[PDB]
Design a protein around this ligand. Sequence first.
Ligand code: NA
Length: 295
Amino acid sequence: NENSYVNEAISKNLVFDQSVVTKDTKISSIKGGKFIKATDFNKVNAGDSKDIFTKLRKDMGGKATGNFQNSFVKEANLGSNGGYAVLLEKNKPVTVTYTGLNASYLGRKITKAEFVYELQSSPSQSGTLNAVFSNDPIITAFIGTNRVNGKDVKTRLTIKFFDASGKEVLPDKDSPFAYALSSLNSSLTNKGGHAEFVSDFGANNAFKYINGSYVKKQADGKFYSPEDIDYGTGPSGLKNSDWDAVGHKNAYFGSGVGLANGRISFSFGMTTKGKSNVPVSSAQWFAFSTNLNAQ
DNA sequence: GGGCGGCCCG
DNA sequence: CGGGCCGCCC
Ligand code: NA
């Protein structure tokens, strides 16, 4: 019951981290979504800062007239190889295919991966979400839109791994995939703030609680910290930089572990618990990796 | 063929 | 870490 540990023995049967990214790693195709031109993505509202999260926090419904080539965005948050801006729409799953991987499951080489993103909830007027998908699959995705009502931002993500022979790599029953659900920060208070969350695990997936994590399943079904761990106003006294960093000893404060006996699938998003007037509560960075913040 | 892996080279 | 060319395999 010690902190940073799961109460079930966990093995990193799958490896999907910085070590799997090669010289050849990139997004080779994005299918099923309207592209957002980089010149449109890069504009911000009057008086806004110029960061990727602010650029995500605008309603781009009907402003997605790009193609694969001109959707390419350069932003340091994306890594040195950039990424692609895409509009997510209800019922229109977007398949991002990564090639040139050197990942591995039980020594079985994983060279390709398909990340399929499907809008589930959006608080903008258009009901759409904006996405930038990084060419680095460990940086993965930035999602957001403008907030006009109290609705969650929510996106479902299904991941399929492929070996060199093009066949899907799925787990042995006794050797589940383990993947990190990290950086689930929260500023929620009695009436303000927001939390990033994961939820809606796929069949044969399960969330595993990390001892000492503030992230647990709430009665609304989602996994988040229901109290502020970002600004120091909650009973834990925690601020974001007290735990939210890659490699931080206490990063498990905002993390869980996903375990999958089958194809990986789950949703992630942001919740204000129904409040419409919470600032900077509609854009997030969701990174997928096996960098478990647990032992 | 086109996409994608595994090569080479440098 | 770029680029090409030669595999093979959707
Ligand atoms: Na976060």
